[PDB]
Amino acid sequence: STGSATTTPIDSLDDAYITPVQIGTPAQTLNLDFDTGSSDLWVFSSETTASEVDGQTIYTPSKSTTAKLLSGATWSISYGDGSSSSGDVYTDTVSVGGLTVTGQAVESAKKVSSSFTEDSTIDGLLGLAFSTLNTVSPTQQKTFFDNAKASLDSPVFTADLGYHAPGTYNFGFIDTTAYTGSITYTAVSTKQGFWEWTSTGYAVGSGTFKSTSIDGIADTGTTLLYLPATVVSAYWAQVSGAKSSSSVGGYVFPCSATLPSFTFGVGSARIVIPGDYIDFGPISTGSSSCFGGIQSSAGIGINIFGDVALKAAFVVFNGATTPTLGFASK
Ligand SMILES: Nc1ccc(F)cn1
Numbered sequence: 001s002t003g004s005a006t007t008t009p010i011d012s013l014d015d016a017y018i019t020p021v022q023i024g025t026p027a028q029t030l031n032l033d034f035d036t037g038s039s040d041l042w043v044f045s046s047e048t049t050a051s052e053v054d055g056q057t058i059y060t061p062s063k064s065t066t067a068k069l070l071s072g073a074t075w076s077i078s079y080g081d082g083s084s085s086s087g088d089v090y091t092d093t094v095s096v097g098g099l100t101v102t103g104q105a106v107e108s109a110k111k112v113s114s115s116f117t118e119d120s121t122i123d124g125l126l127g128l129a130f131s132t133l134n135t136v137s138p139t140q141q142k143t144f145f146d147n148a149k150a151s152l153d154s155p156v157f158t159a160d161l162g163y164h165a166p167g168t169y170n171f172g173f174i175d176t177t178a179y180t181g182s183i184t185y186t187a188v189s190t191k192q193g194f195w196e197w198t199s200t201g202y203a204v205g206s207g208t209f210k211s212t213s214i215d216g217i218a219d220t221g222t223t224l225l226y227l228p229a230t231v232v233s234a235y236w237a238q239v240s241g242a243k244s245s246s247s248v249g250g251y252v253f254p255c256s257a258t259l260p261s262f263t264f265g266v267g268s269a270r271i272v273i274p275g276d277y278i279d280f281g282p283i284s285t286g287s288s289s290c291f292g293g294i295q296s297s298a299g300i301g302i303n304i305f306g307d308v309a310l311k312a313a314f315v316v317f318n319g320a321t322t323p324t325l326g327f328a329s330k
Helices: 116-117 144-151 229-236
Strands: 003-009 017-023 027-034 041-043 068-078 086-098 099-112 124-127 158-159 166-170 184-185 196-204 210-218 225-227 243-245 250-254 260-264 269-273 277-282 289-292 295-296 303-305 313-318 322-329
Touching: 003 086, 041 086, 099 144, 144 229, 166 225, 184 196, 196 229, 210 225, 210 229, 210 250, 229 250, 250 295, 269 322
Parallel strands: 027 124, 041 099, 210 303, 225 295
Antiparallel strands: 003 017, 003 166, 017 027, 017 086, 041 124, 068 086, 086 099, 158 166, 158 313, 184 322, 196 210, 196 260, 225 303, 243 250, 250 289, 260 269, 277 289, 313 322
């Protein structure tokens, strides 16, 4: 089997991407944030604290004839941005663009943190990292990809995020028309539960490529590109007026700037992120100071190849016996 669904940026800045997901019987369509940096499929629901829902579409398990309460199961998760959610669990039929999983754990939110409430465009998350990170207790649950894997024509999913435009998530196949050149595969470590790999280096604009190992994760659920301070300082030193602002929480630059590109290495291959992809607009409404899309990972503990990097490439998340990651230009 295969699945194919369009992913859409939630706003004019590509702050996140939403993909419609069908849950239950009859189908209840919710727009979820496909996240390769987490492993829980959770949704806003009829059980979510009333004051914590503000415009989101909710899943109502009592209206689904295939929903079953997973007895005694609870979940609680915290993300890198300080956000969190928790609640109870149902098993139900979940479909993504024609691909169906019966008995998928659907984590119903009883509580969500302010950032989730404040974002009316995201109805929940669909985790695509390794099932070892799943927070369901006392019986850990599998991801949608992990449940569908054996049924897929090929044990893979692909992320093709658009810049200011819709893109696609495919399951079970590689669309050879969606990229240019060839796909370069690179080794993955699953020890931390992430699609963790090692970039072979970088370049800033038309500058010389620096061969240096950068361990990091391919994460569709993180908006920006988080890299070591030395690399990020080399990037922003090419932009007149750019500086690290402690009050803003990162590198800012004059909105009047035309940004240079950023290249990252995948083996001997090179992925070029165009400069416009690194512009995240005014720091506050009407400001002429803009927020940078490449930020330091110094406070995180890990480098993150978020949407800024992934949207420049066609990315293969290969769930073969030994998982690997594939990157191609597009
Ligand atoms: N880096 C993040 C932040 C929030 C979220 F829901 C997922 N990933």
